[PDB]
Amino acid sequence: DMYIERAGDITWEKDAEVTGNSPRLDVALDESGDFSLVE
Amino acid sequence: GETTDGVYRVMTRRLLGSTQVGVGVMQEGVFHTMWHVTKGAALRSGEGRLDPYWGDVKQDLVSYCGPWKLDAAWDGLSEVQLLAVPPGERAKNIQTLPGIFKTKDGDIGAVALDYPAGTSGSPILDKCGRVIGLYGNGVVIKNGSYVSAITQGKRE
Ligand SMILES: NCCc1cccc(NC(=O)c2cc(Cl)cc(NC(=O)OCc3ccccc3)c2)c1
Secondary structure: OEEEEEEEOOOOOOOOEEOOOOOEEEEEEOOOOOEEEOO | OOOOOEEEEEEEOOOOOOEEEEEEEEEOOEEEEEHHHHOOOOEEEOOEEEOEEEEEOOOOEEEEOOOOOOOOOOOOOOOEEEEEOOOOOOOEEEEEOOEEEEEOOEEEEEEOOOOOHHHOOEEEEOOOOOEEEEEOOEEEOOOOOEEEEOEOOOOO
């Protein structure tokens, strides 16, 4: 049995830590909802 | 139960202790999460119950108490924030410029940020604070890195 617990408000944070890159990837999506890389 | 808008953890006591299996968004009386987090099972919120209303394994999304309400979209140019809610850790906003998933049916925004699997369902927001999708369905790229799609549902 599952339950929910509030974690916070949904707001934009000014001066938040900025990270991550922006890859452009060729992908396929199957009937099970699984993404895969196309090569 | 508590139906105030906000980000919530999705917990289970089936396994050892209380384990965080994912995250979700409460908006306009509807709870929104990823299908793989709950498998569409009913949820408890205090003494109240939340029943599934809509779900789709291929989109990997589910809504409780009502139809999917989130309809904001990434503009394809601007930086976004993952409001990451990791297991046992405080909610934290991380800013990033999304990449692109190129598919035969169109292009989808993607965020290249690495969090535990129990962070699935954390909302990705635009500069106005609107939820443009949920984090947690994507792919593992060559360097073992994780790249999640920005998964958004349709608002009827
Ligand atoms: N494909 C249908 C949906 C589905 C089903 C079942 C699960 C998912 N999602 C994920 O597995 C998922 C989600 C998130 Cl938020 C992150 C990660 N990846 C990550 O960051 O992993 C870190 C790592 C560290 C040590 C060892 C191995 C991995 C995966 C989707």
